[PDB]
Every structure is written in C-alpha cells, then in structure tokens.
Amino acid sequence: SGFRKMAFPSGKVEGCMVQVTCGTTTLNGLWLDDVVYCPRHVICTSEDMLNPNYEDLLIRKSNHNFLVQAGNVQLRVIGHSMQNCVLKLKVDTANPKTPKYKFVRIQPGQTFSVLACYNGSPSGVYQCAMRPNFTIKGSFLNGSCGSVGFNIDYDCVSFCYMHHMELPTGVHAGTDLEGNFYGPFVDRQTAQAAGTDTTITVNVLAWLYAAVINGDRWFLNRFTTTLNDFNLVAMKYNYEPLTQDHVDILGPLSAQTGIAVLDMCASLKELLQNGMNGRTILGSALLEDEFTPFDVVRQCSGVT
C-alpha cells in the first residue's frame, strides 16, 4: 500500500554524468559510448546570449577548447559537432558504464525522472511531467544545465530531456537528446514565456483510479457523462481535453477497479465542482496530475 511520487533508480544515469567546460562556463554533459552530449549554449559568452550565431561561435573552437572531466579523469575531445541545440563532443574513451539506452522524444503529460547535477556530480533525483505548455516544474539552480530526464522501463534507459534554461515564471525548458526543444523555446536570451498551463486530465483520472485501487471511494458518485460534456466542463477549469486515445489508455485501470472511464469522468466533474470538503485523496488536498496511467499500473498492486 501507499502511493508516492517515485523516481527510477538513478545509478545507470549517474555513471554517465560528466562536467564540460568551455571558457568560463561549466555545465553538465551526458557521456554515452564515446560521445558527450551537452547544451550548445556552453559555447556562449556574455555578449552572445541575445543573438548567438552558434555556427559562427563553434567554427572558432578546436577540440582542445572543450574540457571534459569524468570524476577526476580528463577525457580527450577528438571531435565535435552540433545537432540542433546540443553539442556532441567525441572523446577518446568510450564510457565503460554506458547502460543500454535510447533517445525518446516525449509528449505532454508523460512523466520522467530528473537527475539534477552540478559540475558533473549528481545532486538528487525527482519525478517530473512534461506540462501541456512544454515546460517542466523542476528544481534547478545555476550550473544544472545538461542535467537529464529519463525513464528506465526494463533495463533500458530512455533519455528524454536535457535541461537548458529557466523561464521567467520559474519553470524549466529543455530539449530531447537530439537537441530539439520541447515547445516553442529557443536557446536565446530573448523575451519568451510559457503558455498558460493546463491540468493533465488523463493523469488526474489515472490517479483517481489509483486511489480506488488503494481502497478509497468517497469521491465516486452515481452519475456518468458523455465524453463531450465532460470536455465542455473540464476546459472551464483549465483542464486539458480528454480524447478517445486517453479513454482507451485508461481501459485497463477501469477493468481492474470496475469503474467505467466516463463514470470516473463524472466523479472528476464533481470534485472540480465541490472541491474536497476537507478530505484528501492519496494524501493530497489537490488533484494530482503528474502520474500517468502507466505509472499508476507500475506502482499500484494488481488487486484493488
């Protein structure tokens, strides 16, 4: 029993974390086989933040301008290239700790673990979701750029996020490991800002199913809803639309608990209307939207 925001064990990622220095700037890189991946803005100086020309900054660098430190050992950079907004530094040594891994670009609503690091040394691990506005609500201080987000379903680490910057409202923006940003952000110091955020409806539903599985039914009601009427109400609370795809994804949790998806949608409608009247659900006084259907099934028992 119990339900917690659970990260994946971080060891497989820890052994890949390195420190990358260019000029005065130090941040983190991800050392996989013989390549170190890091944000390309490591090559920017003070006068470059506003309108950097990365091709022009990079062509002026040689391999020995990049200092890569793995623990106490220097790695020798023998090549470099730029892919979208990540730098890829070829090094002379393949990482002996390289896990089974792949790169996956995720959709809004997906969760992942973040391994926060500073100077190439891991600091802490926590769980995040990709918000519908393509930002994440992370915990990052200066020097954390190049920290990565990942899942580890089975033995394969799927890297999905690399941290690049903090937006004015205190949320965070970054790229997949191919250097494409999530959302419309750019690695430039311009005025840019997150779209209004919305609640990840399919995740709230999944967490309500988790509360039923752990034995809590007080928020159910005798009603149902059509899909369209649910969405008409949900968007008046800045909830993301719920699609048939999402209704299908919730099928297994529905079968386990005996509560049809649209019946759970009727309970969410009532919660949004009534609030919680001093009660809690899985220990929270707010509706939680950073557990996916997949996360609930992994964390919860198979018996309600």
Ligand X SMILES: O=C1CS[C@@H](c2ccccc2F)N1
Q: Which residues sit at the interface with ligand X, rule CB under 6 A?
A: 41, 44, 48-49, 52, 164-165, 187-189, 192
Nearer to its own copies, 66 or 101 (CB): 101
Residues 6+ apart with CB under 8 A from 75: 18, 31, 36, 68, 69, 91, 92, 93
Residues 85-114, mask of contacts with Cl ion (x by CB under 5 A): ---------------------xx--x----
Residue 263 interacting entry, from Na ion, Cl ion, its own copies, none, C-beta within 5 to 8 Å by type: Na ion
Residue 41 annotated as catalytic: yes
* Residue 69 touches its own copies, criterion: CB under 8 A: no
Residue whose CB is less far from ligand X, 40 or 80: 40
**Burial class of residue 150, CB neighbours in 10 A (0-12, 13-18, 19+):** buried
Whether 160 sits among the annotated catalytic residues: the reply is no
120 binds, among Na ion, Cl ion, its own copies, none (CB under 5 to 8 A by kind): Na ion
Task: Decide if residue 158 touches Cl ion (CB under 5 A).
Answer: no
Question: Is the Cβ–Cβ distance between 111 and 89 less than 8 Å?
Answer: no
- Tell which residue, 120, 174, 124, 116, has the closest CA to residue 147: 116
Task: Please report, as ranges, the residues that interact with Na ion according to CB under 5 A.
Answer: 18, 71, 120, 221, 223, 263, 266
Nearer to ligand X, 38 or 211 (CB): 38
Gyration radius from the chain CA atoms = 22
* 174: number of Cβ within 10 Å: 29
Backbone torsion region of residue 266, taken as left when φ is above 0, otherwise alpha when ψ lies between -120 and 50, otherwise beta: alpha
CB 212 within 8 A of CB 299: no
Contact between 2 and its own copies by CB under 8 A: the answer reads yes
Euclidean distance between CA atoms 67 and 28, whole angstroms: 11
Helix (H) or strand (E) holding 256: helix 251-257
- Minimum CB separation of residue 170 from ligand X in Å reads 13
Does residue 49 bind its own copies (CB under 8 A)? no
Q: Which is nearer to ligand X, 93 or 189 (CB)?
A: 189
- Calpha distance 272→205 (Å, rounded): 12
Nearer to its own copies, 137 or 217 (CB): 137
Residue list 197-226, contact with its own copies (CB under 8 A): 214-215
List the one residue out of 107, 119, 109, 116 whose CA is nearest residue 19: 119
Q: Catalytic site residues?
A: 41, 145
Binding site for its own copies (CB under 8 A): 1-12, 14-15, 115-116, 122-126, 128, 137-142, 166, 170-172, 214-215, 280, 283-286, 298-299, 301
